[PDB]
Enzyme design. Structure first.
Site, PDB file in Angstrom:
ATOM      1  N   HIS A   1       9.403  57.098  36.448  1.00  0.00           N
ATOM      2  CA  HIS A   1      10.804  56.793  36.123  1.00  0.00           C
ATOM      3  C   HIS A   1      11.024  55.293  36.129  1.00  0.00           C
ATOM      4  O   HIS A   1      10.371  54.568  36.876  1.00  0.00           O
ATOM      5  CB  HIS A   1      11.776  57.419  37.120  1.00  0.00           C
ATOM      6  CG  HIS A   1      12.034  58.868  36.887  1.00  0.00           C
ATOM      7  ND1 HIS A   1      12.167  59.773  37.919  1.00  0.00           N
ATOM      8  CD2 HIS A   1      12.206  59.570  35.744  1.00  0.00           C
ATOM      9  CE1 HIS A   1      12.395  60.973  37.419  1.00  0.00           C
ATOM     10  NE2 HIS A   1      12.430  60.877  36.099  1.00  0.00           N
TER      11      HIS A   1
ATOM     12  N   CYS B   1      16.404  56.678  44.124  1.00  0.00           N
ATOM     13  CA  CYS B   1      16.319  58.051  43.590  1.00  0.00           C
ATOM     14  C   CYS B   1      17.275  58.995  44.307  1.00  0.00           C
ATOM     15  O   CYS B   1      17.760  59.964  43.716  1.00  0.00           O
ATOM     16  CB  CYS B   1      14.895  58.623  43.713  1.00  0.00           C
ATOM     17  SG  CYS B   1      13.632  57.739  42.805  1.00  0.00           S
TER      18      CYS B   1
END
EC number: 3.5.3.27
Lengths: 269, 262, 671, 250
Positions: C167, C263
């Site tokens: 990511h 996150c």
């Protein structure tokens, strides 16, 4: 000639999965016809294809299906059948046409039910037994098989369960010639004088097509003893019985993949 | 160096009145035979087909051709009409001429297929002699060059281009040291080529490759699998490569060509 | 409205239950519930000291619901809901959607099977100027135009290339005041160039690998506060040095699943600017490819090339053809993050025989040659294959086809002529094809040994430099290719090299690596096209010399740069294979041999870095008494140069980049 | 040969009264080292299992101190190898030589045979450690940290050491048993032991294959790239870069 329709699913176009399947079919001695293709709507959608595979004999069909099983080829859900079982009759010997296991996670169909194979490794047989804790499917090397055990033969009722990401990827000629001239002379001198010549040899002798020539040397009295390993004997016997040699296309002088079935067959025989 | 000598200068000859003054510590110290053979079979056939059809075959060649004993076979190919042009460097011409005039080749004992030391005298002698006559062609005409690759090119009027390099000794007067002109001369002789035979010539083979369009059969032979793998990026229908002794390759090729036209 | 709100989700049902990223591998059911709750509470309570935190209700069987960054992406009243790549997280989507709806957001949804994973893959510029969007592992390139439209913002696309940094928020962190915390090694060269174009050097905080694998980029920046798992002393010093307060709080239980502080959070109050509107750099083009596609593997090769080059695709349709032997056809939408990348892709697909749909076919673009031997910017680079170009609505055959040339269009007695020409043969006034429209084709040493020689050579180099002696280096292109250029340019910068001898190719590849981060089209970040290579040659020819390229500012670093900046003499000897050549290259080899000889005078040491024929040539010119050091994997330029006796010639058979790496390391040990 | 000597025979010692009558780039290596170091630290920290196979070239090339460090610092849960790597490692540590080659820069077999004879007289590698004659190195650290090892015999073995399993049916069984549960197998130019271990190992095990013989590498990197990584390079250099990288991660 035999025919079988198989189904393959996944990201067929961009992984080249479909393309690897077709290559194996033709390279092994079969032919194919793609009957249909269902295209995924997006890049990440799965696609599906149905392919009719033909082979000139059952033996070649088994070789093809063994390769396709690893790519995740499956039966149409109504063509599913139970794996065929044959008993071991001689300790450390598999029944003829035993299926050869791969490194990949594998399921087998026993009385209508798919069962996970335990202790998976390549070049084994798959033994099936009923236990007080249910059906057990076990990958076993040949020498560990016991009389009475049921072993999968043929290629029905076997599928892989590989996850998506897995299935989708110095001496110059002049020198040599003068050395050979000196060795040939020493060699004839020794044989005529009744001396002793010992040969050590590895599998690369078979792979390079040296096998016929070494054979000839032994036949005509130049070799009084032969020292080697397991591998040169299996490869020599394979090349002579089956016209193949695990890892090498002798005839075309290049590496090849597959071929474990012929190799294991020779060892078992 | 030889090319810098001027008329009138006195130069030491023979070996009298010369000594070294080295200090004490100084003076005191991949392709299998079966593969190659099938490739040769395919190349020999393509080669006869092209010659009978009057097509154009271009050869690039480096000194390792001479060293491996390929020289007699390349000579034969040129003599019998399989080679319409020859592209190489200074070195293949000097080694070919040395092997044929003196029976030696700087750095290699051809006969015994092994490296040797020394030999600079024979090498420099050849370079000096050709410079004296003024060209390879005049060396043939005067009868001092009587056999070999460069000889057959002159006798059969096969054009050749020797492109210079930063390592050239001499050079020969034939060697093109202006590399813009050398690239132009290469490109010109490449026009119309149906096949290019690249006989372990490294830098020249890449240069030729850059200059060559698709639809030209490329055959690349070298003992170093690194240059073979480079030049073979045109797909197995255009390129073929074998990693082998080029003299071995040439030997089989000439044997295989005899089986065809007999 | 100066009040900042985050969305989090407590770890009631958290564990590693499956493996869908490399961090999870090995970690199934290896999470400690107590430590996970305590670590999550640590972050949650720190965040509540500086902001508002809402919670999503946790859900059995969806453990990665704790990673709310991936719920979607909010800007103002709009949210683009995430569509997850893996089924194991797809079950989260209804619960995320539920929360967004309950909180009054306008929820946009992407097409099914078009992956996009929220703020975790798309990070807003902290001044709200644009959105940085990742692709490469989770989010699809083709989701980016949707983000731009729906959230009404400029979107910049960045390609991720390291599977551990799957990511964008694992390796990239916009901060307050224009700062950027990031890990360059996680991105391709194109993306690194984009980052550097957009963020000034003083504002870039590039971290080391040691910090990156601790998830130091996975940071929550509230105002001058940055919250993260762990930071090195070096990193703390950098951040505090520009005015951030660094707060550390352990999150190792969540690193076991591949996530950390960022996150675990989703910022739902983001800066909205009135003047900011949709802008999309992603472009796309539909192509058609025809033949025995499944059989030849041709479609597989095209798609892989598209992806390897930095783009994306969507097969729009595939038609089998209704007899067993007949050809197939596919129409493919090809996507690219920029026009530059699209051109690289379309150039490759052209060789494979890809063509336009009739409705999209256009004439080739042309630009004039204004200087002899120089092509106009963005000239198309020819291949070996037979080629036709579209001029005034008519396709004409290119003559004298040859790779690595330009296509010149001229007018003649009997109509238009299209001719392939090498750059140096172009004449002022010719028209040359640029862009990519209206073009189609028709079908050995041990560890001990290396280390001993490195030790000896480093000592000698430092010794010679310090005494003011002379070291000459010869170097071939393999020095650049293998990854050794930065080591060589460092030797040159720090005074160890008094002259550099080489050829055309090493200068071209060095300049290429430094201008575009490639060498023969290979990203140094991990085959490839000739476009970068030829663009370099053409650019230097247009300036007229390497030094003028340095002076004009287009060469900013590398081997040739340092030679110019430190006035180290260099000589580039031509060869029969030279492309161009560069203006600096000496194509008269009598002269080149003379210039070599002259620079060799007085040399105490010659370091030959796999330069092959230049090495032989230099050995022939050099008398006894000169230390010769010969490095090469070709184990017989080495034995042919290590024939002058061991006391003065040393040889190693090894990778020259590795050798140079060990050498510069050793020089540092001597200080 | 030593193993055939019988109690009561007289053997010549000293030296009197004896006469005779006539490939990977820099980028590549560094990328794999980076990846493998990260994975090793990751597995160690999670309490997983790493198996190493190693051949004598690890010692010869100069890589033994790096391997023994990996073993000392907890990165290796089992060591599979042959007779020769144990002999050379013990030799390098007892006398600073390997096949008579001074590691400080051919050579005789005396050091080598003295090692074999000494360990045979003690009866095992572990008793050599216990008696204090083995004080460091790969085998030392295996003994001191109770890391299981298996030495499979071969047709060329000298001696052999007492620890060496000359019944290869048993050796294959012991290998197989130690391979159970392995998350990663690091194969340090161990040739036939590498092939043998690959044949025994199911999919899903990370395989890292290091060798200059560029086709134990291609024959083991045939299980697909996602789980098998290959480098063609000096194993000592690789081990050197690996331990360096592990230190950077701290």
């Amino acid at each position: 000639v035999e025919s079988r329709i198989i189904r393959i699913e996944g990201h067929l176009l961009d992984s080249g999965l479909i393309n690897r399947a077709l290559d194996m079919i033709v390279d092994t001695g079969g032919s194919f016809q793609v009957l249909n293709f269902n295209l995924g709507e997006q890049r990440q959608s799965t696609s599906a294809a149905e392919v009719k595979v033909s082979a000139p004999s059952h033996e070649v069909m088994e070789e093809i299906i063994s390769l396709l099983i690893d790519l995740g080829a499956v039966d149409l859900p109504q063509d599913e059948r139970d794996a065929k079982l044959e008993p071991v009759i001689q300790d450390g010997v598999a029944p003829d046409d035993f299926y050869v296991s791969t490194i990949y996670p594998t399921e087998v169909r026993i009385n209508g039910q798919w069962i996970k194979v335990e202790n998976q490794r390549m070049d084994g047989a798959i033994a099936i037994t009923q236990t007080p804790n249910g059906l057990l499917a076990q990958c076993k090397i040949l020498r560990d098989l016991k009389a009475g055990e049921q072993v999968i033969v043929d290629v029905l009722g076997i599928r892989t369960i590989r996850k998506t990401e897995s299935r989708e990827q110095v001496s110059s000629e002049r020198r040599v010639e003068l050395v050979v001239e000196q060795v040939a002379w020493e060699l004839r001198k020794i044989r005529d004088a009744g001396g002793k010549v010992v040969v050590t040899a590895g599998p690369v002798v078979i792979h390079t097509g040296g096998g016929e020539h070494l054979s000839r040397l032994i036949r005509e009295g130049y070799v009084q003893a032969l020292l080697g390993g397991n591998a040169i004997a299996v490869h020599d016997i394979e090349q002579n019985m089956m016209g193949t040699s695990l890892g090498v296309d002798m005839k075309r002088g290049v590496a090849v993949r597959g071929g474990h079935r012929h190799h294991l067959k020779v060892i078992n025989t | 160096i030889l090319r810098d000598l001027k008329a009138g200068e006195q130069v030491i000859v023979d070996v009298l009145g010369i000594r070294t003054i080295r200090k004490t510590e100084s003076r005191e110290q991949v392709s299998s035979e079966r593969r190659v053979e099938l490739v040769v079979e395919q190349v020999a056939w393509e080669l006869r087909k092209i010659r009978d059809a009057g097509g154009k075959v271009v050869v690039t060649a480096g000194p390792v051709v001479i060293h491996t004993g390929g020289g007699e076979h390349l000579s034969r190919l040129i003599r019998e009409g399989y080679v319409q042009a020859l592209l190489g460097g200074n070195a293949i011409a000097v080694h070919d001429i040395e092997q044929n005039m003196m029976g030696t080749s700087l750095g290699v004992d051809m006969k015994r297929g092994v490296a040797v030391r020394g030999g600079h005298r024979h090498h420099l002698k050849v370079i000096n002699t050709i410079r004296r006559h003024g060209s390879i062609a005049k060396g043939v005409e005067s009868g001092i060059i009587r056999s070999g690759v460069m000889y057959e090119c002159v006798r059969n009027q096969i054009p050749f281009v020797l492109a210079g390099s930063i390592r050239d000794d001499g050079p020969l007067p034939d060697t093109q040291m202006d590399l813009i002109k050398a690239q132009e001369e290469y490109a010109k002789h490449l026009e119309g080529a149906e096949m290019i035979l690249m006989l372990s010539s490294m830098l020249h083979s890449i240069g030729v490759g850059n200059m060559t369009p698709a639809g030209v059969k490329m055959v690349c032979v070298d003992i170093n699998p690194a240059v073979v793998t480079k030049l073979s990026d045109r797909g197995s229908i255009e390129s073929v490569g074998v990693v082998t002794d080029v003299g071995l390759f040439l030997s089989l090729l000439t044997q295989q060509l005899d089986k065809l036209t007999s | 409205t100066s009040r900042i709100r985050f969305l989090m989700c407590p770890p009631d049902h958290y564990d590693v239950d499956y493996v869908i990223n490399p961090w999870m591998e090995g970690n199934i059911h290896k999470s400690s519930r107590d430590r996970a709750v305590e670590q999550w509470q640590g972050l949650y309570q720190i965040l509540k000291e500086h902001a508002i935190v809402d919670l999503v209700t946790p859900q059995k069987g969806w453990p990665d619901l704790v990673f709310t960054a991936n719920a979607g992406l909010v800007l103002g009243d709009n949210v683009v809901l995430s569509r997850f790549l893996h089924k194991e997280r797809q079950g989260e989507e209804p619960y995320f959607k539920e929360w967004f709806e309950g909180n009054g957001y306008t929820v946009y949804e992407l097409p099914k099977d078009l992956p996009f994973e929220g703020a975790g893959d798309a990070l807003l510029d902290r001044e709200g100027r644009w959105l940085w969007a990742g692709y490469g592992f989770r989010s699809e390139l083709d989701s980016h135009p949707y983000l731009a439209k729906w959230l009404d913002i400029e979107v910049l696309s960045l390609r991720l290339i390291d599977e551990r940094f799957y990511h964008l928020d694992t390796c990239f962190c916009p901060l307050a005041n224009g700062y950027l915390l990031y890990y360059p090694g996680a991105f391709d060269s194109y993306s690194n160039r984009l980052i550097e174009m957009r963020v000034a050097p003083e504002k870039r905080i590039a971290i080391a690998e040691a910090d990156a694998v601790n998830f130091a980029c996975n940071t929550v920046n509230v105002e001058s506060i940055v919250i993260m798992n762990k930071a090195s002393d070096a990193l703390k010093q950098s951040l505090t040095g520009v005015g951030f307060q660094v707060l550390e709080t352990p999150l190792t239980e969540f690193l076991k699943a591949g996530g950390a502080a960022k996150c675990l959070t989703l910022r739902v109050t983001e800066p909205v600017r009135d003047e900011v509107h949709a802008n999309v750099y992603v472009e796309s083009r539909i192509i058609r490819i025809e033949g025995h596609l499944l059989d030849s593997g041709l479609i597989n090769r095209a798609l892989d090339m598209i992806v390897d080059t930095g783009g994306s695709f969507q097969v729009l349709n595939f038609n089998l053809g209704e007899q067993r032997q007949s050809t197939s056809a596919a129409e493919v939408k090809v996507s690219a993050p920029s026009h530059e990348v699209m051109e690289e892709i379309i150039s490759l697909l052209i060789d494979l025989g890809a063509v336009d749909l009739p409705q999209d076919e256009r004439d080739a673009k042309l630009e004039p040659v204004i200087q002899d031997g120089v092509a106009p910017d963005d000239f198309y680079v020819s291949t070996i294959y037979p080629t036709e170009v579209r001029i005034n609505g008519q396709w004409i055959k290119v003559e004298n086809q040859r790779m690595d040339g330009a296509i010149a269009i001229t007018q003649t007695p009997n109509g238009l002529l299209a001719q392939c020409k090498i750059l140096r043969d172009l004449k002022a006034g010719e028209q040359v094809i640029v862009d990519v429209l209206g073009i189609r084709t028709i079908r050995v040493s041990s560890e001990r040994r290396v280390e001993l020689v490195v030790e000896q050579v480093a000592w000698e180099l430092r010794k010679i430099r310090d005494a003011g002696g002379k070291v000459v280096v010869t170097a071939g292109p393999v020095v650049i290719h293998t990854g050794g250029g930065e080591h060589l340019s460092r030797l040159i910068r720090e005074g160890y090299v008094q002259a550099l001898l080489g050829g055309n190719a090493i200068a071209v590849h060095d300049i290429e690596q430094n201008m575009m981060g490639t060498s023969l089209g290979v990203d140094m970040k991990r085959r490839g096209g000739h476009r970068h290579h030829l663009k370099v040659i053409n650019t230097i020819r247009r300036h007229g010399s390497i030094a003028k390229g340095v002076e004009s500012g287009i060469i900013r670093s590398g081997v040739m740069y340092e030679c110019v900046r430190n006035q180290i003499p260099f000589v580039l000897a031509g060869s029969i294979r030279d492309d161009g050549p560069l203006p600096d290259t000496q194509m008269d080899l009598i002269k080149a041999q003379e210039e070599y000889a002259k620079h060799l005078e007085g040399a105490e040491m010659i370091l030959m870095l796999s330069s092959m024929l230049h090495s032989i040539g230099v050995g022939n010119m050099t008398p006894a008494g000169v230390k010769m050091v010969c490095v090469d994997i070709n184990p017989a330029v080495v034995t042919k140069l290590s024939d002058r006796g061991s006391i003065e010639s040393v040889g190693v058979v090894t990778d020259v980049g590795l050798f140079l790496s060990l050498l510069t390391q050793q020089l540092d040990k001597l200080t």
